[PDB]
Amino acid sequence: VNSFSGYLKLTDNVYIKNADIVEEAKKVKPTVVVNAANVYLKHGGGVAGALNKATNNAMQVESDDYIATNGPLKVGGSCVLSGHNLAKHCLHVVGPNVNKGEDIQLLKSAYENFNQHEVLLAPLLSAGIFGADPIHSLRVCVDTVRTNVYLAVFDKNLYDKLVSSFL
Numbered sequence: 001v002n003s004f005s006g007y008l009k010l011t012d013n014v015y016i017k018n019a020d021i022v023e024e025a026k027k028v029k030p031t032v033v034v035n036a037a038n039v040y041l042k043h044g045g046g047v048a049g050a051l052n053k054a055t056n057n058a059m060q061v062e063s064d065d066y067i068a069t070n071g072p073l074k075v076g077g078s079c080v081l082s083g084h085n086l087a088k089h090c091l092h093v094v095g096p097n098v099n100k101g102e103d104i105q106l107l108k109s110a111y112e113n114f115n116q117h118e119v120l121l122a123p124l125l126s127a128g129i130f131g132a133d134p135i136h137s138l139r140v141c142v143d144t145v146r147t148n149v150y151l152a153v154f155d156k157n158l159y160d161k162l163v164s165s166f167l
């Protein structure tokens with residue numbers, strides 16, 4: 001039993017809610033919140049900009065040190081950093097950004113990172129300003145992640161569309 005509330009059950013292990021992931025994180029303090037990162041960990045907009053703002057830019061400061069030491073992530077890759085005031089850990093996951101011309105095929109690899117964590121609070125990877133088809137991303141999610149994932153979808157119309165079209 002865990003402390004996620006008001007989530008609609010999609011599958012054995014995937015639940016979904018129309019909610020602001022920052023507010024969910026501040027409420028639940030999950031072990032892991034997922035960030036929809038880019039390879040440089042430059043947290044400008046979308047999930048990343050929103051999470052980082054909620055940490056008072058501490059996420060960005062930590063991320064800049066990570067990149068200075070380790071170099072960029074791979075598209076499809078991830079790293080574990082602090083969750084600051086939002087969670088114990090933040091799993092920064094790089095899905096493909098279709099608006100950068102990146103290979104949507106790498107979305108499955110991106111979701112595989114979730115399997116290294118028993119429970120996660122997460123956004124829908126590559127959705128929104130990452131420009132992928134969100135129905136497709138939800139399918140790849142449910143068909144790839146085997147651990148317990150709680151998805152927070154910001155946009156109400158998007159949430160309604162995702163629920164109504166889910167197979």
Ligand SMILES: O=C(O)C[C@H](NC(=O)c1ncnc2[nH]ccc12)c1ccccc1Cl
Pocket residue numbers: 020021022036045046047050123124125126127128129130152153154155158
């Ligand atoms: O779930 C959505 O609608 C799409 C989602 N965006 C957010 O979660 C989000 N965006 C902007 N400001 C925000 N403030 C609090 C949450 C938040 C998203 C997921 C992956 C990649 C990019 C994007 Cl854009």
